[PDB]
Amino acid sequence: SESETLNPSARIMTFYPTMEEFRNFSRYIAYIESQGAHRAGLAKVVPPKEWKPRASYDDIDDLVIPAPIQQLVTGQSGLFTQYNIQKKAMTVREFRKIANSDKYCTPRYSEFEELERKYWKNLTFNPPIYGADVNGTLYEKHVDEWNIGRLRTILDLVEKESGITIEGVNTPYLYFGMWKTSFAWHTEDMDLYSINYLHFGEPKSWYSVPPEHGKRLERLAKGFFPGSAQSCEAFLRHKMTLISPLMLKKYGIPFDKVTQEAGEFMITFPYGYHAGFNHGFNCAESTNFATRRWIEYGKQAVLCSCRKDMVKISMDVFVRKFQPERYKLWKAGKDNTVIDHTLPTPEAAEF
Ligand SMILES: O=C(O)c1ccc(O)c2ncc(N3CCNCC3)cc12
Ligand code: NI
Numbered sequence: 001s002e003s004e005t006l007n008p009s010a011r012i013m014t015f016y017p018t019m020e021e022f023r024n025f026s027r028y029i030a031y032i033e034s035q036g037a038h039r040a041g042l043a044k045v046v047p048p049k050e051w052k053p054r055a056s057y058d059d060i061d062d063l064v065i066p067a068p069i070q071q072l073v074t075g076q077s078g079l080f081t082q083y084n085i086q087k088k089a090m091t092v093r094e095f096r097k098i099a100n101s102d103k104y105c106t107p108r109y110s111e112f113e114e115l116e117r118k119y120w121k122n123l124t125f126n127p128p129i130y131g132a133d134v135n136g137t138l139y140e141k142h143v144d145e146w147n148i149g150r151l152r153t154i155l156d157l158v159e160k161e162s163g164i165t166i167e168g169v170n171t172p173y174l175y176f177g178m179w180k181t182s183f184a185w186h187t188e189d190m191d192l193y194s195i196n197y198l199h200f201g202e203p204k205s206w207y208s209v210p211p212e213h214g215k216r217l218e219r220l221a222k223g224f225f226p227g228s229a230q231s232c233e234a235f236l237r238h239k240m241t242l243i244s245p246l247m248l249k250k251y252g253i254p255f256d257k258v259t260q261e262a263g264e265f266m267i268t269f270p271y272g273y274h275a276g277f278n279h280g281f282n283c284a285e286s287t288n289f290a291t292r293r294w295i296e297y298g299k300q301a302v303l304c305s306c307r308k309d310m311v312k313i314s315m316d317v318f319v320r321k322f323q324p325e326r327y328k329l330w331k332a333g334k335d336n337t338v339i340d341h342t343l344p345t346p347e348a349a350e351f
């Protein structure tokens, strides 16, 4: 009731923490949730200006991108499917040269709405290369605030208990973008949170649908791609499906849009569908994390049913540790708990 009164429009919120607020990562997430941020599914956090995670990005031209992917997009009328074509390894220097070449570079424009229109007009032409899923971090070893290599959230329980690492999920990924490279509509694996920091370059634009409206987006997508939906219980997790804002408007799906600049963080929340594109040559770092509120999403995440090497995290350790009274009921398949997408994580109490 009090949570439904905070950010009731479920618009994307933007925060400007001071250094003292910034220092404690998990505490700040709880705070923005206490302000209703999660209701949007996506939030922006602008870090204090005296903060930098790396002195210089002049020394990484030799960094290898082992598996660049060329993004072939097919479709019309605002509905598309993206096919990946893996290309040969290349260095950042090589990647940047291609990105900034006349062939792949960002078109000229005035307002963002103009670039956005060009993206949706030309997305099936001249398929770009995305230097995605590069294992690594660009943080200096001694950065202790919002360090994507070690956020110290309860997601650490996975590795801690089982030794299991899942690349990009409890380890960091780098993404080197160029004009018109895309990320398709999806929620995170196991419906986890994610953090995304744009180290440098041109912006990355995002779309998001409130978790409270996630099911509507799913119903729409199933009607649009009945073949894919029949074959898999969670086809959007393939991350191949692109849907334009006009199409969302046309079918009454609530969504917001936000543009991320170099030096800014984006947080995505459990069950927040999102998608977007890069404006030009840029570099982003990301990984997943959890709070106590995520556990229930974890137990209920509807998972891809047709592919091996799909991400599945055993929820057992979390339920034992944080929901001991529900453990036996849950193991017996009788845990009928219903998720309230508006409630902030328990850690937010102090706020
Ligand atoms: O591309 C982005 O900036 C991006 C932004 C936000 C997300 O939640 C993403 N999730 C997955 C993803 N892909 C890239 C292609 N290989 C599989 C992982 C990219 C992103
Ligand atoms: Ni993602």
Ligand SMILES: [Zn+2]
Pocket: 232, 233, 234, 235, 238, 304, 305, 306, 307
């Ligand atoms: Zn599947």
